[PDB]
């Protein structure tokens, strides 16, 4: 309600599966640009934003979420356009006079400005999913653990099909699932009433 996202593009995951997954950790990079420069926030692309202000890694797994707002933010903002060397991914530079001259140019934001030159708020959510106890997780409620029946299970975003049996496998304090044979998850740990279940 009351927020219409102009661009919601997820690389590595899909926006239809963000409910089912629990992330180990999430970072949110937040900034504000022009309306036509939203298309530059994608892995493997260059421009004035993806070269001199904010670059994305090629092994990216996240979601770019950008929405137009030409009325909330009115004024003047700064951007870099004259750097000698392109940035490494996920890096920051604050040297305004690294070339001696002012390398930070201004650009204004009024409601009565043409189409491409309007303020868009961009949030890049970079999250990683691995064998760790998750912190940020989806809104799906839990169910009763049923054993000795061929069931579909969704344990912390590890969707599978099998029979859960009480087992005594040796896990660490941080392990959430067990790889065995040719990389198959066959020993897992339920997040509520933590114990070891063999699939």
């Amino acid at each position: 309600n009351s927020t219409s996202f102009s661009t919601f593009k997820c690389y590595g995951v899909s926006p239809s599966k963000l409910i089912d997954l629990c992330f180990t950790s999430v970072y949110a990079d937040t900034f504000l640009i022009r309306f036509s420069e939203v298309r530059q926030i994608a892995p493997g692309e260059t421009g004035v934003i993806a070269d001199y202000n904010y670059k994305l890694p090629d092994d990216f797994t996240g979601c770019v979420l950008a929405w137009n707002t030409a009325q909330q933010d009115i004024g003047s903002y700064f951007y870099r356009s004259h750097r000698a060397v392109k940035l490494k991914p996920f890096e920051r530079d604050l040297s305004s006079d690294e070339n001696g001259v002012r390398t930070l140019s201004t650009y204004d934001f009024n409601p009565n400005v043409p189409l491409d030159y309007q303020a868009t708020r961009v949030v890049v959510l970079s999250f990683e999913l691995l064998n760790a106890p998750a912190t940020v997780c989806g809104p799906k409620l839990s169910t009763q653990l049923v054993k000795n029946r061929c069931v579909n299970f969704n344990f912390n975003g590890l969707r599978g099909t099998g029979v859960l049996t009480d087992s005594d496998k040796r896990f660490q304090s941080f392990q959430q699932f067990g790889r065995d044979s040719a990389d198959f998850t066959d020993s897992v740990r339920d997040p509520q009433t933590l114990q070891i279940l063999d699939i």
């Binding site: 490494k88 920051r92 604050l94 040297s95 691995l130 392990q175």
Partner: protein, 243 residues
């Protein structure tokens, strides 16, 4: 100020994911075997300030007589023009403060006087204490090992040590210059140099690293990386181009 050899003391965990009972290859920054160090000793008169190169990661070491080393300063100009890391160990808390620093001549305790526009400030909280620092995708990865070092004329042991991955930082800063903070009251610290290397790493049932290969130095290491094994039967084998 002399030179010693890296007796297999630079092996760390490359990926944060979990693996067990496998032998896998990598093309990561690594400190290869039989390398060189630049370790300096503390006398009555000794080093004051030196900017050694932070070349895509650094292997730091000490022997730490009492509490001699206090931390590290990572930067690219070491002024109040570009921000700096300034890892310290005051009291019993380890803190990181990415701010603009007008620090003094020699970093010592009993390190900085002027600090403005902080972009990051976090509090974390005969001993070896060897570290590996690297920077990748705006993240400062630190891999530490608190080994109870053996006993002067200093050197390095030959016991293998899988350096446990410590905390990493979302700093968002590029680093090429580096400085060590010491204690001046009116020990040894050692500097390595990371480079891109293909390596082979084994894992046990506990997720611990058993042994390393570093197939860029020896023909037997290259053979071990070629045949995807650590035990090699008697015979002749063609090898790849890992050197």
């Amino acid at each position: 100020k002399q030179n010693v050899s890296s007796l297999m003391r630079g092996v760390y965990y490359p990926d944060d994911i979990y693996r067990s009972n496998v032998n896998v290859l990598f093309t990561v920054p690594f400190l290869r075997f039989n390398s060189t160090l630049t370790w300096y000793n503390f006398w009555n008169q000794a080093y004051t300030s030196r900017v050694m190169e932070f070349g895509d990661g650094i292997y730091f070491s000490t022997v730490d007589k009492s509490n001699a080393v206090r931390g590290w300063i990572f930067g690219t100009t070491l002024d109040n023009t570009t921000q700096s890391a300034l890892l310290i160990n005051n009291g019993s808390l380890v803190t990181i403060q990415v701010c603009y620093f007008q620090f003094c001549a020699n970093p010592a305790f009993l390190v900085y006087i002027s600090s403005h526009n902080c972009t990051y400030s976090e509090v974390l909280s005969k001993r070896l204490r060897e570290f590996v620092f690297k920077n990748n995708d705006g993240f400062l990865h630190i891999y530490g090992a608190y080994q109870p070092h053996v006993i002067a004329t200093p050197s390095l042991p030959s016991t293998f040590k899988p350096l446990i991955p410590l905390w990493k930082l979302p700093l968002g800063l590029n680093i090429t210059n580096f400085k060590v903070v010491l204690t001046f009251r009116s020990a040894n610290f050692a500097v390595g140099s990371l480079k891109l290397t293909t390596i082979m790493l084994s894992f046990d049932v506990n997720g611990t690293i058993d042994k390393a290969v570093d197939c860029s130095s020896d023909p037997l290491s290259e053979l071990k990386c070629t045949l995807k094994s650590f035990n090699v039967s008697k015979g002749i084998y063609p090898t790849s181009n890992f050197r």
